[PDB]
């Protein structure tokens, strides 16, 4: 169980102005820290955010959050469920900003909702420094789906924050799960991201802005465009046939088969120069906080093993780049 703490800086809020927070379980003898970003799509104008407020309020408000959550998958403390980092200090940061973790805008007389996802991450880091983070050796920023994209948008800023606060000895790394999307042609979203960025006052990593410049920052929400610009190590976990990708492609089998196969091949191609990556040929969504995340294997190697191999490589038979080459979903027998 991770215990809830609401942010002491009450100017950092969820969408409706209620305070944001984080769930924590410390591990007294460990210098490793895992900060996980929850997913759950986004909203991009008032009408669309109003609908989300009626039926997905826990992703917009803390007023109904429970006092504890159970850690599962990579957030488990049991070595059988989590061979990789079971002894780590565990943090679960709920998603209540609906901005793919990019926003820096307070609720005010001109704004019905607050979009502060980028500021929420920074404030969590600040408040953890007085709870043991100041003696850390590694901080792994992880996240799933919209939280996976949020890792890519925020990992370099966390490292920059700790450097300027005087902690250059903490190694910041990222783990992006199911947040690596393509801006491809539909079978029958870029505009939604572009409009949300303006609604949210969203921010993107600095080198990626300087390349694409004003009006085009929406490009930095796509992994294969922002990843080459990042300075911190980032491991990428991504199903070749991600369910959210097929949704934004209007896919829900006759020859026009070719579309799904072309999607698998293109996502394969974008990962060719990503040295640390795990990409099975499955139709599914998220993996790292699910209880049976140890079951999936790529070419004989499990995901917890690959993450351990990544750890050693940052210090034979322990690979870190694992991408399936079969071109149809569920061709890998270990798919969920
Ligand atoms: C261009 C675009 O639409 N990108 C995108 C898609 C889905 C997202 O979230 C899915 C989830 O959180 O399940 C977040 C961002
Ligand atoms: C509280 O958070 C806001 C937004 O990030 C920041 O401007 C302000 O300086 C913070 N206050 C304190 C006391 O940390």
UniProtKB/Swiss-Prot annotation:
Glycosylation site positions? 9
What Enzyme Commission number(s) does the record list for this chain? 3.1.1.98
Active site annotation, chain numbering: 145, 242, 285
Q: Name one GO cellular component term.
A: extracellular region
- Keyword Ubl conjugation (UniProt): no
The protein's induction, as recorded, is:
Up-regulated in hepatocellular carcinoma (HCC) with high intracellular beta-catenin.
* Keywords noted in UniProt: Glycoprotein, Hydrolase, Phosphoprotein, Secreted, Serine esterase, Signal, Wnt signaling pathway
List the molecular function annotations (GO) for this entry.
Answer: palmitoleyl hydrolase activity; phospholipase C activity; protein-containing complex destabilizing activity
Subcellular compartments = Secreted
What happens after mutating residue 145 to A? Abolishes enzyme activity. Unable to mediate serine depalmitoleoylation of WNT proteins
Q: Which reaction does it catalyse?
A: [Wnt protein]-O-(9Z)-hexadecenoyl-L-serine + H2O = [Wnt protein]-L-serine + (9Z)-hexadecenoate + H(+)
- Tissue specificity of this protein: Rarely expressed in adult normal tissues.
Homology family: Belongs to the pectinacetylesterase family. Notum subfamily.
* Official protein name in the record: Palmitoleoyl-protein carboxylesterase NOTUM
Q: Whose protein is this, by species?
A: Homo sapiens (Human)
> What gene is this protein a product of?
NOTUM
């Amino acid at each position: 169980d991770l215990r809830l703490h609401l942010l002491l800086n009450t100017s950092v809020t969820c969408n409706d102005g209620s305070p944001a927070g984080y769930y924590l379980k410390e591990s007294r003898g460990s210098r490793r820290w895992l900060l996980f970003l929850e997913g759950g799509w986004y909203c991009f104008n008032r009408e669309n955010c109003d609908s989300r407020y009626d039926t997905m309020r826990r992703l917009m408000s803390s007023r109904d959050w429970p006092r504890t959550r159970t850690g599962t998958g990579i957030l488990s403390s049991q070595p059988e469920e989590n061979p990789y980092w079971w002894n780590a200090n565990m943090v679960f940061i709920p998603y209540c900003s609906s901005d793919v973790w990019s926003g820096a805008s307070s609720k005010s007389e001109k704004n019905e909702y607050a979009f502060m996802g980028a500021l929420i991450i920074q404030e969590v880091v600040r408040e953890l420094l007085g709870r043991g983070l100041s003696g850390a050796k590694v901080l792994l920023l992880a996240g799933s789906s919209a939280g996976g994209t949020g890792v890519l948008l925020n990992v370099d800023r966390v490292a920059e924050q700790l450097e300027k606060l005087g902690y250059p000895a903490i190694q910041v790394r990222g783990l992006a799960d199911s947040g690596w999307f393509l801006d491809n042609k539909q079978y029958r979203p870029t505009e939604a991201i572009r409009r949300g960025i303006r609604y949210w006052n969203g921010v993107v990593p600095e080198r990626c802005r300087r390349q694409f410049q004003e009006g085009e920052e929406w490009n930095c929400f796509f992994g294969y465009k922002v990843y080459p610009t990042l300075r911190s190590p980032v491991f990428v976990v991504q199903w070749l046939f991600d369910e959210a990708q097929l949704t934004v492609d209007n896919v829900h089998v006759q020859e026009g088969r070719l579309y799904i196969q072309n999607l698998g091949r293109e996502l394969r191609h974008t990962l060719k120069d990503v040295p640390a990556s795990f990409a099975p040929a499955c139709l599914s969504h998220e993996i790292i906080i699910r209880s049976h995340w140890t079951d999936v294997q790529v070419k004989g190697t499990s995901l917890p093993r690959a993450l351990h191999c990544w750890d050693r490589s940052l210090h034979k038979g322990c690979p870190v780049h694992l991408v399936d080459s079969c071109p149809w979903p569920h061709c890998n027998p270990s798919c969920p």
